[PDB]
Design a protein around this motif. Structure first.
Motif, mmCIF file in Angstrom:
data_model
loop_
_atom_site.group_PDB
_atom_site.id
_atom_site.type_symbol
_atom_site.label_atom_id
_atom_site.label_comp_id
_atom_site.label_asym_id
_atom_site.label_seq_id
_atom_site.Cartn_x
_atom_site.Cartn_y
_atom_site.Cartn_z
ATOM 1 N N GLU A 141 56.811 85.516 33.438
ATOM 2 C CA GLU A 141 57.403 84.925 32.227
ATOM 3 C C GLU A 141 57.904 86.072 31.355
ATOM 4 N N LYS A 143 58.090 87.187 28.485
ATOM 5 C CA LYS A 143 57.622 87.140 27.101
ATOM 6 C C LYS A 143 57.599 88.509 26.428
ATOM 7 N N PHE A 146 60.681 89.663 23.272
ATOM 8 C CA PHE A 146 60.540 89.086 21.922
ATOM 9 C C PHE A 146 59.101 89.069 21.453
ATOM 10 N N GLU A 183 65.521 86.190 14.495
ATOM 11 C CA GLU A 183 65.646 84.839 15.058
ATOM 12 C C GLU A 183 67.107 84.483 15.378
ATOM 13 N N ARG A 186 67.457 86.083 18.711
ATOM 14 C CA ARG A 186 66.770 85.182 19.654
ATOM 15 C C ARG A 186 67.713 84.049 20.072
ATOM 16 N N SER A 187 68.333 83.407 19.080
ATOM 17 C CA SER A 187 69.347 82.368 19.323
ATOM 18 C C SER A 187 70.474 82.862 20.231
ATOM 19 N N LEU A 189 70.567 85.497 22.318
ATOM 20 C CA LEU A 189 70.093 85.832 23.667
ATOM 21 C C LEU A 189 69.607 84.597 24.466
ATOM 22 N N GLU A 190 69.089 83.576 23.778
ATOM 23 C CA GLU A 190 68.755 82.290 24.433
ATOM 24 C C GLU A 190 69.958 81.690 25.158
ATOM 25 N N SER A 191 71.148 81.932 24.616
ATOM 26 C CA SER A 191 72.393 81.424 25.184
ATOM 27 C C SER A 191 73.112 82.435 26.096
ATOM 28 N N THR A 192 72.424 83.516 26.484
ATOM 29 C CA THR A 192 73.022 84.564 27.318
ATOM 30 C C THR A 192 72.257 84.688 28.645
ATOM 31 N N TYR A 234 64.293 90.575 31.006
ATOM 32 C CA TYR A 234 65.688 90.295 31.292
ATOM 33 C C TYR A 234 66.412 91.544 31.824
#
Ligand SMILES: CN(C)c1cc[n+](Cc2ccc(CCCCc3ccc(C[n+]4ccc(N(C)c5ccc(Cl)cc5)cc4)cc3)cc2)cc1
Ligand SMILES: CN(C)c1cc[n+](Cc2ccc(CCCCc3ccc(C[n+]4ccc(N(C)c5ccc(Cl)cc5)cc4)cc3)cc2)cc1
Ligand SMILES: CN(C)c1cc[n+](Cc2ccccc2)cc1
Ligand SMILES: CN(C)c1cc[n+](Cc2ccccc2)cc1
Lengths: 353, 353
Positions: A141, A143, A146, A183, A186-187, A189-192, A234
């Motif tokens: 995972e 984790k 972040f 954050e 975070r947003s 990179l969540e979409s990358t 990642y």
């Protein structure tokens, strides 16, 4: 030849005598050779060797590296042992509570300027791709990235500096609203998309050996070392973090003991060269894809790694602020933090994000 | 299918989900399968598996073994990882503070009677020779054997039993003068050549897997497991200790929960069969030696292993007395200690030493 303290000479002699086979087993204390490679308070390094007048009996090493520390212990030791077994790191000769005996690899570290040499960059990419392709018995995972940034940010917002200059510099760094920025990152990179792979997490010149006697060879003249910060993470972070390291020279001999140059970040041409070597090393029938499918994969990777480069700046910037407070080693930590956050916003401006 | 406690089911699900790739990563808790293999207070074992209706995505295992513990930690983990890399033990899928995830090997353990089957004995010998031939990053001074016996003897002479039968049995065992006997054994073994090699130290039927589907195969139907007591040690101990285990059946279902038969120790014919397989596996041009040179090596090995068998009795006898005092598991420990010391003196009488 800097000599270790008498207590360290004796301890080193005993570890070599008991952990190494052949001529080592019968070695007399007065025949033992040891010199200091790096001293300090932790991660101390020594070279230990047989007398030139002692023959080896079998396949034992004539010279070894002694690393002193001065459960993270378990994970680090298992990782090192596995990379050794796979011929991807120095062999492991001995392990004990105070440290380890490792294969000595004649070499020097790379300098920052050497990272951009096309043959060097190509090999780093191939080496990183090789590490990314392998299975390790650790948490998969992602984790770490972040998780570490959140933990460090919380520490940074609790720091009470007493020294005037650090107080002022901290106020400036915190004025950006770091919780909000984190954050938003975070947003983004969540979409990358970026595959989760076994990452080095610290791929820079200090951790890359130039193998002695191979300096003029076309390929296979490097070894990646010092995987102590490795984890599943990642892929974009490992590559982006490496690219960021093109900008920083830690050899500067006056305060703040580093130079930063934004202009030394790889150009898109240089980034393409790197990823063109990475890809066929990570996906072995890659070259058989159409020029067009390869082109799209490269374009999408360029976007991925450059977005993840933002996390390299943010993570190291936070790390550096914490070091300013807690470290026992002299370095311009607050100035380095500012350099990373300057690069963060510069990169954000260029990306339009 | 014995089900684990709810807290263990949940912990196991999380470890599998986070440490194993492919279909595991997206597995829902209500699709997770787990059963108890062995319960208890320490070294608990569980089988964990995907639903039969879930396809694997890549090369991930469908079923794994979860081992719970319930620095020795570092050495054990490094050893396990290295044997896995070398294809000499189950693969290592995950490591964490509470335990590990290992490859599941369909199999059963051997029974005591099976140790004497000529094909089984030949393979055990070949397997032991293979382990003895390898390099490990551990202390090579053979201090383990007598170091452990001295430590255990000191404990035994400080035991204060409260229970009548243990008091009486202890008085008898100590009446032999164990300090004197130990140092006489030290003297004998000091004069008995035996190479120092990486030893299992516990090679008996409980630690040998009979591989499912290979039961009728001539060769390669076994796997040696459970190396947690392994160390560099005299080769003669590993072989002699194995021979001693021919005499003990731990499957007896009434007190004292073992049977001992002195007559089941391998005959010299059976010992020769074992060493005739060990030798060419340990020294690979062995067969090319003359019949006469091979004969002398075998004779000298017979003497070596039978003398070292005495240390197996002495060590396990002391261990068993300590267990009688400290263990939380039911077993006839004092009776077992007496059986080992009876065998010790019997062997001494036969050897004329
Ligand atoms: C400043 N910077 C990058 C440098 C500076 C200098 N050098 C060469 C050099 C020059 C001078 C010195 C003397 C000063 C000591 C500075 C120092 C001590 C210890 C580390 C180890 N370290 C590796 C990875 C890591 N990660 C992956 C990480 C984890 C968690 C977060 Cl939150 C962030 C990041 C965190 C920590 C590095 C540097 C030592 C070495 C290389 C790089
Ligand atoms: C009695 N005996 C050999 C047995 C009895 C039974 N079984 C099968 C079996 C049957 C019933 C039980 C329930 C009772 C638990 C007894 C027990 C608990 C833990 C161990 C682990 N263990 C391995 C190696 C070792 N060495 C190498 C060692 C180190 C230091 C010295 Cl000083 C001496 C020796 C020390 C300890 C073994 C047995 C469990 C297992 C196999 C062998
Ligand atoms: C408040 N005190 C004793 C200290 C605070 C910070 N440091 C680390 C440090 C030293 C030199 C330059 C940068 C960082 C050491 C002591
Ligand atoms: C004195 N007390 C509480 C005990 C002493 C010894 N044991 C171990 C034991 C149990 C059963 C048979 C053999 C050994 C448990 C408790």
């Amino acid at each position: 030849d800097e000599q270790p303290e008498p207590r360290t000479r004796r301890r080193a002699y005993l570890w070599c005598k008991e952990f190494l086979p052949g001529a080592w087993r019968g070695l007399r204390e007065d025949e033992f050779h040891i010199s200091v490679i790096r001293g300090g308070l932790s991660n101390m390094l020594f070279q230990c060797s047989l007398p030139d007048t002692t023959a080896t009996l079998g396949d034992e090493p004539r010279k070894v590296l002694l690393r002193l520390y001065g459960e993270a212990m378990v994970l680090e030791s298992v990782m090192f042992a596995i990379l050794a077994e796979r011929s991807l790191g120095p062999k492991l000769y001995g392990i004990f509570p105070q440290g380890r005996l490792e294969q000595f690899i004649p070499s020097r570290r790379l300098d920052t300027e050497e990272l951009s040499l096309p043959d060097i960059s190509a090999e780093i990419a191939e080496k990183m791709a090789t590490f990314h392709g392998m299975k390790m018995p650790f948490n998969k995972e992602p984790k770490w990235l972040f998780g570490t940034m959140e933990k460090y940010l919380k520490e940074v917002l609790r720091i009470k500096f007493t020294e005037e200059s650090r107080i002022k510099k901290l106020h400036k760094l915190l004025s950006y609203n770091l919780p909000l920025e984190l954050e938003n990152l975070r947003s983004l990179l969540e979409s990358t998309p970026s595959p989760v792979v076994f990452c080095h997490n610290d791929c820079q010149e200090g951790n890359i050996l130039l193998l002695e006697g191979r300096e003029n060879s076309e390929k296979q003249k490097l070894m990646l070392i010092d995987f102590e910060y490795s984890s599943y993470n990642y892929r974009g972070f490992d590559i982006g973090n490496h690219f960021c390291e093109w900008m920083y020279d830690y050899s500067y001999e006056k305060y703040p003991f580093f130079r930063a140059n934004i202009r030394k970040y790889p150009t898109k041409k240089q980034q393409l060269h790197f990823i063109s070597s990475y890809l066929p090393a990570f996906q072995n029938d890659f070259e058989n894809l159409s020029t067009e499918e390869k082109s799209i994969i490269k374009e999408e990777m360029l976007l991925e790694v450059n977005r993840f480069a933002l996390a390299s700046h943010f993570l190291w910037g936070l790390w550096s602020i914490v070091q300013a407070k807690i470290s026992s080693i002299e370095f311009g930590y607050m100035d380095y933090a500012q350099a990373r956050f300057d690069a963060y916003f510069h990169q954000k401006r260029k990306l339009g994000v």
